[PDB]
Amino acid sequence: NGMLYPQSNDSRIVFPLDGVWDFRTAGEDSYPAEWADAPLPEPLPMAVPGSYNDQNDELNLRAHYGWVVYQRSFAVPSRLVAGQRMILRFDAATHAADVYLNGQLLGSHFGGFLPFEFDVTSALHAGENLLTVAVDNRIGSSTLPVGNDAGTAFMGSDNANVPAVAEAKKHARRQNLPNFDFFNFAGLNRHVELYTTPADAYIADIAITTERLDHIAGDACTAANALIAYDVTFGGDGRQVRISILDGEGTVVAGVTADIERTAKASGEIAIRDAKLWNPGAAYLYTAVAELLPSRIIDAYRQTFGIRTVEVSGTTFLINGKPFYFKGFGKHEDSYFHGRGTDDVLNVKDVSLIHWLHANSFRTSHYPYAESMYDLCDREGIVIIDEVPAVGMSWLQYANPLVAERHREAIRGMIARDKNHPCIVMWSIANEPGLDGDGERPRQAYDYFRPLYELAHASDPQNRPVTLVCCQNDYTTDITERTMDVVCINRYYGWYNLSGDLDAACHALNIELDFWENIGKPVMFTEYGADTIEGIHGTHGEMFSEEFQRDYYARINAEIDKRPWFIGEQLWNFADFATFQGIIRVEGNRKGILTRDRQPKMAAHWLRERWAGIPDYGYK
Amino acid sequence: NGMLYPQSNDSRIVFPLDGVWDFRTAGEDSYPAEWADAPLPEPLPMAVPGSYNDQNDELNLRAHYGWVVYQRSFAVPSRLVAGQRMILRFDAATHAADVYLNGQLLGSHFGGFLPFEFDVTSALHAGENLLTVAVDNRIGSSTLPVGNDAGTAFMGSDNANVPAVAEAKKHARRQNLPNFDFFNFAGLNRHVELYTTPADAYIADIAITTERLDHIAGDACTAANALIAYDVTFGGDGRQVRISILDGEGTVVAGVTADIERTAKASGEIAIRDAKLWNPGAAYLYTAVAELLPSRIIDAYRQTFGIRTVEVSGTTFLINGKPFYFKGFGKHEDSYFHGRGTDDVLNVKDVSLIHWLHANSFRTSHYPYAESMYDLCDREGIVIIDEVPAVGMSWLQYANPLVAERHREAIRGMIARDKNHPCIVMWSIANEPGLDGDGERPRQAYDYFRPLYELAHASDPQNRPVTLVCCQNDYTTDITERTMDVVCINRYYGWYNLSGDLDAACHALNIELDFWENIGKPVMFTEYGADTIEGIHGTHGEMFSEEFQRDYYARINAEIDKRPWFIGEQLWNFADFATFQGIIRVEGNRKGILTRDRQPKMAAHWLRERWAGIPDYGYK
C-alpha cells in the first residue's frame, strides 16, 4: 500500500534512471515481444521524464494511437546491491505499461498519474542491464480519464446526419477521442529510478496526522499543544522503531520508541507543546524520522509533515479554526516541450507566480500531479485540492465494473501517496461527471458516487473534506453535488451561455446562487472564465479580448462577494494549455489568465490587485 | 423599375450628400418623429457613407437595438433645380429607413443592400433644406437577412436546460440575433446624393444584352460579328432616341436612331463587326450612349457594357463558348472602421489582390455589393456571382408572405440594378436555406425556391444561369439544389466534421462527389476553408494554424482536380471579417486567406501559386 518517495540516507540509496532513452512507436494494439529481449532496432532518442508526443517533429506522435516502447541500459556496482532489496520505481507511465528487465516480465500497471514499483532483487544482474517499458496511450469507455469509443472528442464539431460523414467515420484512422478538455499526452511523464532498502526488515509506509490542537493562538501561528498520531508499516521477515520529531531548524523536539506488532506496524501518539502550525501563506514543516532498531540503525526514513487541522463547519472552511477563503485556479501539468512531463523549473516558477498573483491555492485538475509539486506547496504555503483522473464520466461508466474498480484504485492510490502533505485540505473524486436529468439517472449517479465519497473518507487518516467538481448542469435534478462536504461548481455563465452578456450572466448566476444559499453547504467556484487571445483588444471588449476576460471576473466576483457562504474562487485556468484540436480550441484552451509561456494577460493584473486585498482568513 | 446610377452631363447634374452628418440613437421600436422638424438635439457626428456601429467608442453601438436618426442640411442654387425633376437617391440604408425632407415624410424602404429614391421636386425649397433619415437595424424571422426572434445567434453556444439560463433569457436586453455568420452592420452604408433629370421627358432605364456571336476567334478576343440588343425606358409626359456604340477608344463604331413607343420604350438590335469581347482576365468595355432627340439634345445617359455570352451546357460553363473554371472566394463588404460601409480605396486594393492571387471571380456573399465594385470588376476582368440577402432561411420563413415578398423584391431589385454588367455571369437566389430533411420539408423548400429560380430567369434580359448556394447538408434528401443551373456547394469536410483528419475528409468529399457525378450538373465550391490565426504555426499544422489552412486546400483541391465536371473553386473567405461574438469566432470569422488588413497568410501564397498555373479557359 505505501509508496514513500525514494529516499537516500545511511540505509538506502536512490539510483535515478532519467536521461535520454531509446524509443520506437509500435502498433495500435501490439508491440513486438522481442523488443524486450535485445536492444531496440533503429531507436529514436526520447528524454525521460517527459511526454513523448512533442519530442519529435519528423513524426506526428500527437496522432499516435496504441503502444510505444522505451528502453535503456544501466549498470550499478555489486557492492551497492549486495544484500539489499532492489526496487524499480515508475513515478508515472501514462496510461498503462508493461515492464521488462533482462527479457523477463516484471509486471504491468494501469493508471497514468500514480506511481508503481517492482522488486527487481532477483532479475538484476551484474554489468549492463536491459530495461524495456512498453507504454499504452489508449483511452476509451472503460479508462480513467474517459475516452470516447466512437464519434467526436469532447467539445468536437460534427455533421453526423451527412451520409458521406457517417461513411467516412467507419474507415478513419483510429485515434484517441478524449472525453476531457486537455490533450492526451502519453509516455514516461515522471521520473524513473532504482532504489535500495534493507531486505530483512524495512519501513514500507508512514502516516502522520494532526489529531488535535489545544488553544490555537489568535494569529494561528502556534497552538499551546498539538496531538499528532503516527502509523509506521514495515515489510520483511521483539522489534522497535524510534520516532524523532524535528522542528524547522532540525532540532529534536519530541521522540518516542515504539513496539512493532504483527502487517508489522508501530502506531502511537505524540504531544508537541508550543507547536508551530502550518498555514496558507505561512508554511511551517516538521520531520518525522523513523529508525528501525536492531547503537546501529537498521532502516531509516525522514517524513516531512505540517501541523494543521481542517474542518468544514456549517458554511465555513476552517483551517486551524480560522475561516479560510480559497483564491486560485485549476492548473494543468502542461508546457511546450514536456507536454505533461514533470518539470521542476516550471513548478518552481509557477509557485512564485501563484505568490505574485496573491492566490493561495489550486486544484490538481484533473489527475494527481507530480509528487515534488506537493513538496513545493508544503514549503511555500499553497493549499491544494487533490483530484483523481475520473474526468469524462457518465452513466455508461457507472454500470461498468472495471471503471468502478479503477476509480477506487485511483482514490486509494492518490490518498496513499499524498496523505502526509499539510497543503492538501480536500480531495476531489471526479471532475464533471453526469449527475442530473430525469428518470433514474440522478439516483444512478448518486449510487455510483456515494461509496466513493465514503472510500475517500476512510482511506484518509486525516479525514479531510471530500468534494466532487460539478459541471454546469440542472442543479435542480442533480442530487449528488449537494451532499458533498464542500460544493465545488464549474460555471460559465456569459461564456458558454448568455454569451457576452455580463448583465444576463450575473442575473443567471444570482438565480443559481439563490438556490445554493438555502442548501447550507460551503460553496466555491472551481472553474469559470473566458477564452482570451493575448493581444486582442477592444474598447468594449468582446469574447476573446483581454478586456472581456477582465470584465468577466470583475462582474462575476462582485456577485459572489455578496454571499457569506461562498468560501472560495478557483477560476479556469492558471495558464493556457494543449487540448485535442477542434473548432473551439485556438491552439488549445485559452482560458488561462497567463499564456502558456506564463505571461500575464490583462485579467491576471486585475485579479492580482483584487487578491492582494483579500486575506487568507476572515474575509467572510 | 430601373435604377441607373446617377450621372452628370449636359442635361443632368448629381449633387453628393456624403460627409459628416448629425446623428442620434433612438428607441427599440420607436424614434421621435418631431426630430424631422428641427435640428436633432445634442447630435453626434457620423460619417456618411459608413456603418455607424464602429464610429463611436464612447457608446456601444455594436450593441444597439432599434432605430437611429441621421440628419444634415443642404442648399443648392435655385438656377439648377429650375425646371428639373429632382431625385434623392439612397444607395443603401441598412435595413429599413423612413426619409423626411423639410418635415415631410417622403416614404420608407426595407432592403438593406439595394438603392431606393424619392421624387423631391416639390419638397425642396430655396436655401437650407433639412434631411432626416431614420434607420432601423432590427432583424428577425421576417427580415432578409434573417434574424432569430429568441434564443441564440447562429453558431451560438447555449446551456438551455439550466433553469437560471432560461429565466435570465426572459429579461436579457434585446439584441439582434443574426441567423447568419456576419456582423449586423447598419446605417447609411452607401452614398446619398441628389440628382437632376429633365422634367418633361427623361431616360429612366437602359438594358443592353449580348444576343448572339458569329465566328468567335480561337482565343475568344473577338467575334466576326456580335448581335446586341437595347431596351430604353423613358418617364415623363412621335419621339426618337439616338443610340451610339463607342469602343474602348471612344470611336462610334455603330449607332442607330430608334422610335419611342407607348409606358414609353425604344427597343431594337445592333450588329457590331469584329466585336471585341469581354473575357475574364482580359476586359473590354463599350459604351452605349442614349440621346433623347427633340440638332440639340434633350437628355442623355452613358451606359457601359461588355459583349460576351454565358451558357451552361452539360457539365460546362461557357463564356463566349469557352469552358470557364472559377478561381476565387466568397467576399464580404467588411473592414475595420467602415464596417459594411462602402470604401473605394478598399475596392481598388481588393481587385488588385484578386489579380495578385491569380483568382478570376468572387461571389457577393451574402448581399449585393456597392455599385462601384461591379464597375470596377467590369473594367478589371473579374467575374461575379451576384447574390441577394436571402441568408438564414428555413421552413419558418417559407410560410411567411411578408418574407416571400421581400425575397421577390430583392431578386427583382438586384437584377434591375445589375443587369448591364458583363462581369456578372450568374445569380444566387439564397445562401444556405434549409432544403433537406424528412417528411414534407424537402418539398416545401422546393415549392418555395422554384418560383424564385424562375423569377430570376425572367427578370434578367441576358437570361444568365441561376443558382442557390447550399449549406453542408444531407444531399440525398435535398431535392432543390440539384435543379439549379450550376450546383454551388458550401462544404467544410475536415473542419466542422471529421475535424483535423484530412484523409477522412477527402474520403467523405469523394463520397459526396460520387453523388454529384451521377447528377450530371456542373458543380463548384462556393465555400470551404478553416479558421486560421495568422502567426499560429506548427510543423504538423493543427486547426487554426497557418500550415493547416494550407494543407486543407492542398488536399481538398487535389480531389476536385480529378473531376471534369467540377467547374470552379470559390473558397471561404477572401479576408477575415467581423461577426456577432461567440465561442467559435475569434474576433470574427478567421477563414480568410488574407487577414482583415488584407495581409497574406501562408495559404494565400500557396493558392496564388496553384492559381497561377490554372487557365481561365480549358483547364477541364
Side-chain angles (χ1 to χ4, degrees):
Chain A
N1 188 252
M3 294 289 295
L4 301 172
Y5 200 84
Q7 210 159 90
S8 307
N9 63 33
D10 197 66
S11 322
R12 298 191 168 211
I13 192 41
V14 177
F15 182 41
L17 280 173
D18 293 339
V20 168
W21 293 36
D22 291 329
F23 172 105
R24 293 286 312 268
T25 61
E28 300 191 338
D29 60 342
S30 61
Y31 57 85
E34 70 277 5
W35 290 359
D37 293 341
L40 301 180
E42 291 150 76
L44 304 177
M46 189 65 56
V48 345
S51 299
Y52 62 71
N53 306 84
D54 281 5
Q55 297 198 50
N56 200 289
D57 291 68
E58 282 191 287
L59 309 174
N60 188 18
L61 303 181
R62 282 202 175 194
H64 192 68
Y65 176 92
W67 290 95
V68 305
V69 183
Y70 289 79
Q71 188 178 75
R72 60 162 296 176
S73 285
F74 70 90
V76 123
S78 289
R79 81 210 75 111
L80 281 36
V81 295
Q84 315 297 315
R85 171 169 166 271
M86 306 303 301
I87 311 299
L88 173 49
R89 196 159 127 155
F90 290 85
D91 293 5
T94 308
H95 295 285
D98 309 328
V99 178
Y100 309 78
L101 184 67
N102 296 328
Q104 289 289 129
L105 176 63
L106 310 173
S108 297
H109 178 269
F110 173 86
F113 303 91
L114 286 167
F116 58 103
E117 73 194 9
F118 301 100
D119 192 312
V120 290
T121 304
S122 56
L124 279 168
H125 66 219
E128 295 304 322
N129 290 262
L130 185 76
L131 172 56
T132 309
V133 179
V135 185
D136 183 8
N137 72 9
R138 285 170 303 158
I139 50 166
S141 63
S142 69
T143 61
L144 295 174
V146 170
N148 297 333
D149 288 338
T152 64
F154 184 54
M155 277 146 172
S157 178
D158 202 359
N159 298 115
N161 64 314
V162 174
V165 163
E167 190 51 37
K169 287 180 179 171
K170 297 167 165 188
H171 305 293
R173 175 181 180 188
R174 271 154 85 198
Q175 37 173 1
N176 291 302
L177 299 173
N179 200 38
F180 47 93
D181 185 38
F182 55 90
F183 188 89
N184 192 43
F185 284 116
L188 295 190
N189 280 324
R190 304 180 187 147
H191 307 274
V192 178
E193 58 280 345
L194 177 63
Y195 76 87
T196 268
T197 75
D200 293 331
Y202 54 85
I203 298 156
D205 199 6
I206 302 179
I208 303 293
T209 51
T210 297
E211 295 289 310
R212 199 188 65 245
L213 302 175
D214 315 318
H215 296 289
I216 298 155
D219 62 18
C221 287
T222 53
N225 180 65
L227 185 71
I228 66 169
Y230 66 82
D231 215 286
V232 190
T233 304
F234 304 84
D237 287 336
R239 301 303 289 284
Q240 297 181 309
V241 55
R242 181 170 54 244
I243 292 163
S244 320
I245 301 317
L246 281 49
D247 73 9
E249 285 187 336
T251 303
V252 181
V253 292
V256 63
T257 304
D259 293 332
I260 299 166
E261 300 172 0
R262 165 61 244 154
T263 319
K265 183 175 141 291
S267 182
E269 307 172 328
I270 306 184
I272 300 181
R273 72 188 274 207
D274 302 334
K276 282 120 193 78
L277 305 193
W278 188 106
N279 286 284
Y284 191 93
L285 294 179
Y286 289 78
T287 312
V289 178
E291 293 163 309
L292 175 69
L293 307 172
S295 187
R296 82 176 178 283
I297 298 149
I298 301 305
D299 196 17
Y301 193 92
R302 313 178 33 112
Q303 175 63 54
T304 296
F305 70 90
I307 290 189
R308 56 88 185 86
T309 59
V310 178
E311 180 203 352
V312 168
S313 179
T315 57
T316 63
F317 193 98
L318 299 183
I319 309 173
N320 302 322
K322 317 282 176 217
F324 180 63
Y325 189 82
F326 289 84
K327 306 170 299 179
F329 29 55
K331 281 181 116 289
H332 258 305
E333 288 183 327
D334 171 278
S335 49
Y336 260 107
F337 313 113
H338 305 265
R340 187 128 298 115
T342 191
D343 186 330
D344 275 319
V345 168
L346 184 51
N347 287 342
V348 167
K349 181 188 188 44
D350 271 10
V351 155
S352 82
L353 281 158
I354 296 175
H355 298 321
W356 175 82
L357 290 164
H358 308 110
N360 57 30
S361 64
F362 62 93
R363 168 168 63 112
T364 77
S365 36
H366 301 290
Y367 37 78
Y369 280 3
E371 289 158 276
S372 56
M373 171 61 128
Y374 308 81
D375 294 334
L376 197 45
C377 287
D378 288 334
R379 60 174 289 177
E380 295 295 302
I382 303 173
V383 156
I384 291 177
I385 303 181
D386 203 6
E387 183 182 280
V388 293
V391 56
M393 298 184 86
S394 75
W395 290 277
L396 171 52
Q397 279 74 43
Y398 305 149
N400 183 334
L402 173 56
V403 177
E405 181 62 17
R406 283 167 171 180
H407 203 157
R408 291 187 288 271
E409 300 169 347
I411 288 172
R412 293 189 302 260
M414 179 183 66
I415 297 187
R417 195 187 68 169
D418 298 353
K419 51 186 197 289
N420 289 325
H421 298 300
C423 73
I424 295 167
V425 305
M426 177 157 68
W427 316 103
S428 178
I429 64 174
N431 182 77
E432 300 205 327
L435 309 177
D436 70 335
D438 45 49
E440 283 303 290
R441 269 191 170 188
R443 172 65 49 183
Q444 295 173 305
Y446 184 75
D447 291 334
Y448 180 81
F449 277 106
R450 187 67 177 190
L452 299 179
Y453 163 101
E454 295 169 5
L455 173 63
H457 273 284
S459 316
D460 178 15
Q462 190 64 57
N463 193 46
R464 284 108 146 166
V466 172
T467 193
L468 176 159
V469 174
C470 189
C471 69
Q472 181 110 58
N473 69 0
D474 189 352
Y475 45 84
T476 76
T477 58
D478 171 349
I479 59 167
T480 298
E481 176 65 31
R482 64 203 288 162
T483 75
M484 298 293 142
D485 304 323
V486 175
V487 165
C488 290
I489 55 169
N490 297 351
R491 302 296 182 253
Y492 291 93
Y493 291 111
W495 182 258
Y496 291 119
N497 61 69
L498 306 165
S499 291
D501 191 339
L502 294 193
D503 290 345
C506 287
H507 178 194
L509 175 58
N510 271 320
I511 292 171
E512 180 177 354
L513 288 174
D514 284 348
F515 166 93
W516 294 107
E517 186 151 279
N518 293 321
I519 302 295
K521 251 93 166 60
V523 181
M524 59 185 291
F525 285 132
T526 40
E527 290 180 24
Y528 57 131
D531 284 78
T532 308
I533 305 306
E534 66 272 15
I536 297 176
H537 286 278
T539 57
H540 297 269
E542 288 183 5
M543 297 171 64
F544 283 97
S545 62
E546 297 198 29
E547 285 84 5
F548 177 86
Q549 186 186 41
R550 168 255 165 244
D551 298 340
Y552 187 87
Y553 285 119
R555 290 292 308 273
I556 293 300
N557 284 347
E559 302 309 332
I560 52 158
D561 274 343
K562 297 168 184 169
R563 303 296 181 140
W565 48 259
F566 209 85
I567 66 154
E569 52 194 69
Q570 286 195 349
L571 60 87
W572 197 252
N573 188 280
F574 178 75
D576 303 345
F577 56 90
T579 66
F580 196 76
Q581 65 180 308
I583 74 173
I584 74 169
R585 284 306 172 255
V586 188
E587 206 184 21
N589 184 296
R590 305 298 286 281
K591 301 210 187 34
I593 55 171
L594 305 175
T595 64
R596 191 153 195 236
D597 297 335
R598 281 26 189 193
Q599 300 145 297
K601 322 185 176 170
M602 158 179 317
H605 292 292
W606 183 94
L607 286 162
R608 169 180 191 234
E609 181 172 39
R610 162 181 177 86
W611 285 340
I614 295 177
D616 291 337
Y617 291 144
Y619 187 44
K620 301 180 178 188
Chain B
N1 177 256
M3 303 292 298
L4 299 172
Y5 204 80
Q7 179 177 113
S8 296
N9 54 36
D10 200 55
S11 326
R12 305 181 170 211
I13 196 44
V14 172
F15 177 51
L17 287 170
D18 300 332
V20 176
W21 293 40
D22 277 319
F23 174 103
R24 285 290 302 262
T25 65
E28 316 196 334
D29 58 322
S30 70
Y31 62 88
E34 57 270 32
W35 283 5
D37 287 330
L40 297 177
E42 287 179 343
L44 305 161
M46 189 56 60
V48 165
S51 308
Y52 62 68
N53 309 84
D54 291 8
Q55 284 193 69
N56 199 298
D57 284 67
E58 296 192 277
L59 308 177
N60 191 4
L61 301 177
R62 287 211 174 186
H64 190 67
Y65 184 88
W67 287 99
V68 306
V69 177
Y70 286 87
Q71 182 184 85
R72 55 157 311 160
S73 300
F74 65 94
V76 302
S78 288
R79 57 187 194 100
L80 281 279
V81 312
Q84 311 305 292
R85 165 164 169 283
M86 300 316 289
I87 300 322
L88 164 71
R89 188 166 137 127
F90 298 81
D91 290 6
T94 311
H95 290 291
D98 308 334
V99 177
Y100 299 80
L101 173 58
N102 299 323
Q104 306 290 99
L105 174 67
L106 298 179
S108 310
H109 187 259
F110 178 88
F113 303 95
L114 281 177
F116 66 85
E117 56 193 29
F118 300 89
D119 191 322
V120 289
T121 314
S122 67
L124 291 173
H125 54 51
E128 301 292 321
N129 291 256
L130 185 66
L131 175 56
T132 303
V133 186
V135 185
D136 175 14
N137 73 11
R138 284 175 300 168
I139 46 165
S141 53
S142 69
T143 57
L144 293 174
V146 179
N148 293 331
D149 295 336
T152 60
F154 186 39
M155 283 137 313
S157 185
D158 209 350
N159 294 116
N161 61 316
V162 172
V165 165
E167 185 59 35
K169 292 174 165 166
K170 290 176 190 187
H171 304 281
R173 176 185 177 188
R174 301 230 45 187
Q175 77 173 323
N176 289 301
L177 308 165
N179 208 33
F180 49 85
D181 181 38
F182 56 95
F183 189 88
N184 190 47
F185 286 123
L188 298 188
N189 278 325
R190 290 178 197 149
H191 301 277
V192 188
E193 60 274 353
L194 178 68
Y195 74 87
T196 280
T197 71
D200 272 349
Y202 59 81
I203 297 157
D205 196 15
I206 301 173
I208 310 292
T209 55
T210 299
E211 285 297 330
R212 186 196 83 233
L213 299 182
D214 308 329
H215 301 306
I216 297 173
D219 61 7
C221 289
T222 53
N225 173 63
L227 196 60
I228 72 173
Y230 60 82
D231 212 307
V232 189
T233 305
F234 308 76
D237 288 345
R239 303 300 287 282
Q240 290 174 306
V241 57
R242 179 53 174 197
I243 305 179
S244 309
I245 309 292
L246 281 50
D247 71 355
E249 297 170 333
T251 310
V252 185
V253 297
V256 61
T257 312
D259 296 328
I260 301 163
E261 301 308 26
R262 251 160 57 197
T263 179
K265 189 152 284 317
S267 66
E269 316 169 330
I270 297 189
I272 293 192
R273 297 123 202 93
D274 302 332
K276 289 127 192 67
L277 299 191
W278 184 103
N279 294 272
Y284 193 92
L285 292 173
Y286 287 85
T287 316
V289 180
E291 284 165 318
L292 179 64
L293 309 181
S295 199
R296 267 176 29 266
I297 298 305
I298 301 318
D299 189 26
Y301 196 87
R302 299 168 57 99
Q303 179 51 68
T304 302
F305 78 93
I307 304 172
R308 53 96 178 87
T309 65
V310 185
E311 164 182 10
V312 163
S313 156
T315 57
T316 71
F317 192 100
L318 309 164
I319 310 185
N320 302 323
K322 319 283 198 210
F324 180 65
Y325 188 79
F326 296 77
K327 303 179 284 176
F329 17 67
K331 277 185 99 293
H332 258 297
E333 291 188 323
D334 166 282
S335 53
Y336 256 103
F337 313 110
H338 303 269
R340 186 120 306 116
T342 192
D343 187 339
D344 278 325
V345 172
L346 189 53
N347 291 336
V348 160
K349 176 178 187 71
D350 279 354
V351 161
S352 86
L353 281 161
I354 297 174
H355 291 329
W356 184 80
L357 286 158
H358 306 113
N360 57 27
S361 52
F362 64 87
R363 170 168 66 113
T364 72
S365 29
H366 304 289
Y367 39 82
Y369 292 174
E371 296 160 271
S372 58
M373 176 64 125
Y374 308 79
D375 295 329
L376 184 49
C377 287
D378 284 347
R379 54 168 299 173
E380 297 289 307
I382 288 157
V383 159
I384 287 166
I385 299 174
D386 211 3
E387 181 171 285
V388 297
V391 56
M393 312 190 68
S394 61
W395 292 276
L396 186 59
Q397 274 75 44
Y398 308 152
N400 185 328
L402 178 54
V403 162
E405 192 55 26
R406 286 156 172 193
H407 204 163
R408 296 188 289 261
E409 296 172 342
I411 303 177
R412 297 195 280 255
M414 187 186 45
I415 294 177
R417 193 194 66 175
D418 293 355
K419 43 181 188 306
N420 291 320
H421 288 298
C423 68
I424 285 161
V425 306
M426 182 158 59
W427 316 100
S428 174
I429 56 189
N431 182 77
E432 302 190 330
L435 295 181
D436 66 343
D438 45 72
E440 260 300 280
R441 256 179 179 202
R443 175 59 56 175
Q444 296 169 305
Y446 180 83
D447 299 328
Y448 177 85
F449 280 109
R450 186 72 190 177
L452 296 173
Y453 163 98
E454 283 149 13
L455 171 63
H457 269 287
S459 311
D460 178 20
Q462 185 69 43
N463 190 41
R464 286 132 176 146
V466 173
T467 188
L468 175 172
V469 162
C470 191
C471 60
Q472 183 115 49
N473 67 5
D474 185 351
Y475 41 83
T476 65
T477 56
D478 183 350
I479 69 175
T480 303
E481 183 52 41
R482 67 188 81 198
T483 73
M484 296 292 123
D485 299 329
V486 168
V487 168
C488 289
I489 49 175
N490 288 0
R491 296 305 184 252
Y492 292 88
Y493 288 114
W495 185 258
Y496 291 126
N497 54 69
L498 301 170
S499 285
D501 183 346
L502 294 181
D503 288 340
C506 279
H507 188 202
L509 179 54
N510 272 311
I511 281 157
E512 187 173 347
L513 299 173
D514 284 343
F515 176 87
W516 287 111
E517 181 156 293
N518 203 40
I519 299 313
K521 250 126 169 11
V523 179
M524 60 182 292
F525 279 136
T526 39
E527 294 182 19
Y528 63 133
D531 290 69
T532 295
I533 308 299
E534 63 281 3
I536 288 188
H537 281 283
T539 59
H540 296 269
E542 295 185 5
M543 303 162 53
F544 287 99
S545 70
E546 295 193 37
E547 290 78 1
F548 182 82
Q549 191 183 41
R550 175 255 176 243
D551 302 340
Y552 183 90
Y553 290 120
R555 291 296 300 281
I556 295 295
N557 286 344
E559 297 312 322
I560 63 167
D561 280 342
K562 299 166 175 174
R563 305 305 178 128
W565 43 273
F566 201 98
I567 60 147
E569 54 191 65
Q570 284 198 335
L571 62 80
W572 193 252
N573 188 278
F574 169 82
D576 295 347
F577 61 90
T579 72
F580 188 93
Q581 68 185 313
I583 67 181
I584 71 171
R585 289 296 171 263
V586 182
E587 207 183 29
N589 182 297
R590 302 302 293 278
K591 303 197 184 51
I593 59 166
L594 316 170
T595 77
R596 198 171 191 220
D597 297 317
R598 276 39 185 186
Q599 302 146 294
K601 303 174 192 162
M602 179 176 306
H605 300 283
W606 189 86
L607 283 160
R608 157 165 203 257
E609 178 72 20
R610 177 189 164 71
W611 283 339
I614 296 187
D616 292 336
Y617 292 149
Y619 182 65
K620 277 160 161 216

